[PDB]
């Protein structure tokens, strides 16, 4: 008749390989850029000088036209 | 002849670790900086005052 | 052990998920801002015309060539 039951079977196969890691989160935004440069005084100086030249030149025109009676 | 098969074997070992995930995308550029300063009315007046005061000799030449 | 070996065991568990991806790099600084807006020639003329007239008149008086009378 029967001999004894056999020994335990072999270990099962290894499990399937794991899935790839989760995706990284996006990086932070960069900081704001530096401030723009301030407007320089040059444009103001230029107009002030133009105005001065204009008004001074008009003093002479005024004197001439006063003498002519044609202001 | 034979006898019964033996008991079932143990479970196999765990599978291999998965590959590392991809790095996230870089962040966006920061916003532009603030605008530079525009001249105030008081600042304009002060520049004009300085220009006048530095040209008294030139004014005098045209007023003689 | 006259009988044959038992059936194989079941498959092992699936392997662990891989290491998570790292956070992305920071973005770059943004660009410099726009330059400051220059005052208009017209606004400069509005703000400074009067003082120029006044100072011209005062200097003319100093030099003893006072001018056409100015606006009240």
Residue numbers in the entry:
A (entry chain B): 1 to 71
B (entry chain A): 1 to 64
C (entry chain C): 1 to 72
Task: Give me lines lifted from the publication on this model.
Two host-guest collagen peptides (GPP)4-(GXY)4-(GPP)3, where (GXY)4 sequences are from the α1 and α2 chains of human type I collagen, were recombinantly linked to chains A, B and C (corresponding to α1, α2 and α3 in collagen nomenclature and omitted here to avoid confusion) of the NC2 domain in the following combinations designated as α1Aα1Bα1C (for short 111), α1Aα1Bα2C (112), α1Aα2Bα1C (121), α2Aα1Bα1C (211) and α2Aα2Bα2C (222). Three unique chains form a parallel α-helical right-handed bundle.
All five constructs were screened for crystallization, but only three of them yielded crystals of sufficient quality, crystal structures for 111, 211 and 121 were independently solved using the MAD phasing from selenomethionine derivatives (thereafter designated as 111sm, 211sm and 121sm) to 2.25 Å, 2.10 Å and 1.6 Å, respectively. Whereas the crystal packing for 111sm and 211sm are similar (two trimers per asymmetric unit), it differs from that for 121nat or 121sm (one trimer per asymmetric unit). An overall superimposition of 121nat and 121sm (r.m.s.d. of 0.35 Å) confirmed the identity of the two structures. On the other hand, superimposition within the NC2 domain demonstrated high identity of the trimerization domain and adjacent residues within the triple-helical portion. Most of deviations observed for overall superimposition of trimers are attributed to distal flexibility of the triple helical fragments caused by crystal packing. Namely, a triple helical chain linked to chain B of the NC2 domain is always in the leading position, the one linked to A is in the middle, and the third one linked to C is in the trailing position. This way, construct 121 (or α1Aα2Bα1 C) translates into staggering order of α2α1α1, whereas 211 translates into α1α2α1.
